[PDB]
Amino acid sequence: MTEYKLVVVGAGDVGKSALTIQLIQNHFVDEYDPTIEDSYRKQVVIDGETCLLDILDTYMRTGEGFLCVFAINNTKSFEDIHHYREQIKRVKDSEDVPMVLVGNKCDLPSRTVDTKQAQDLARSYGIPFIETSAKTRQGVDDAFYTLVREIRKH
Ligand SMILES: Nc1nc2c(ncn2[C@@H]2O[C@H](COP(=O)(O)OP(=O)(O)NP(=O)(O)O)[C@@H](O)[C@H]2O)c(=O)[nH]1
Ligand SMILES: [Mg+2]
Numbered sequence: 001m002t003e004y005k006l007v008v009v010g011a012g013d014v015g016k017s018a019l020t021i022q023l024i025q026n027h028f029v030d031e032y033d034p035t036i037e038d039s040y041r042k043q044v045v046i047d048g049e050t051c052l053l054d055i056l057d058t059y060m061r062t063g064e065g066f067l068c069v070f071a072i073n074n075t076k077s078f079e080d081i082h083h084y085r086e087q088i089k090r091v092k093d094s095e096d097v098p099m100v101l102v103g104n105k106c107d108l109p110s111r112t113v114d115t116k117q118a119q120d121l122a123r124s125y126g127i128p129f130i131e132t133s134a135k136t137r138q139g140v141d142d143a144f145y146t147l148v149r150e151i152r153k154h
Contacts, residue, residue, distance in 0.1 A: 001049065001050055001051045001052065002049065002051045002052075003051060003052045003053075003054060004051065004052070004053060004054070004064050004065065004147075004148050004151050005054050005056070005062055005063055005064040005065075006053060006054065006055055006056065006063070006064060006065055006066065006067060006144070006147055006148075006151075007055075007056035007057075007058055007060045007063040007066055007067075008020060008055065008056065008057055008058060008066075008067050008069060009058055009060075009066055009067070009068055009069065009084050009088065010058075010067075010068060010069030010070060010077065010080075010081075010084070011070065011071075011076065011077035011080045012077075013071065014069045014070055014071040014077050014104055014105075015069065015071060015104040015105060015134050016057060016058060016069050017029075017032045017057050018032070018104075018134040018135075019067075019069065019102070019104060019132065019134050019140060019143075020040060020055050020057045021134070022134045022137055022140050023042065023053075023055065023140055023141065023144055024040045024041075024042050024055065026137070028134050028135045028136075028137070038056065038057045038058075039054070039055070039056050039057070040054075040055050040057070041053065041054045041055065042055070044145075046145050046148055046149070051148075053144065053148070055144075060091075061091050061092070063088075064098065064151050065097070065098030065099060065100075065147045065148070065150055065151040065154075066088050066097065066098065066099050066100070066147070067099075067100045067102055067143060067144070067147055068081050068084050068085060068088070068099060068100065068101050068102065068127075069102050069103075069104055070101075070102075070103055070104070070113065070118075071103070071104050071105045072103045072104065072105055072106065072108065072111045072112065072113040072118075072131070073105050073108045073110060073111060073112060074112060075112050075113060078103075078113045078117070078118070078121075081101065081121070085099065085125060096154070098147060098150040098151040098154050099125075099127045099147075099150065100127055100128055100129075100130060100143055100146050100147045100150060101118060101121065101122045101125065101127050101128070101129045101130075102129070102130050102131070102132050102143045103115075103118050103129065103130075103131045103132070104131075104132050104133065104134065105133060105134075105135075106131050106132065106133035106136070106138060107133050107135055107136050115131070118131075127150075128146055128150075130142055130143040130146055
């Protein structure tokens, strides 16, 4: 079937790796042990088109579409997403590159990125915003299938 090369980007401990795992083994890890594989893959169905997801946990010119991740519990990571999109679309000679902004760590009650704040950042960058929590799985599948449609409708 069709295969889609997604890479997860973002700042430190935002939960890039942690997002992946939950997507692949439907489980929430509390600490990765310094990089093992970094490049998993999963068979899924999206609207009948069953297809494969090659997730690269962070060369990435290969990437087809990108999830940009910031944790909502610290605003530095959320400021750094400009630096990422600006670099995603750098090594890609196109301001058009399938992309999803995801805010992680929703069970955390001391949030410091307003849900509006992302929401507006997203629309200004043209992309969609999803909120996730690898610990409670909420919208972890959601944020990935979104990216896959942003690649197919591209
Ligand atoms: N409460 C909560 N903690 C989360 C959530 N997602 C990730 N974390 C935690 O945040 C920490 C960072 O996870 P990790 O996947 O290593 O983040 P990372 O982006 O891979 N960090 P690094 O850039 O060092 O590889 C982990 O210990 C994980 O338990 C979430 O939704 N809720
Ligand atoms: Mg990681």
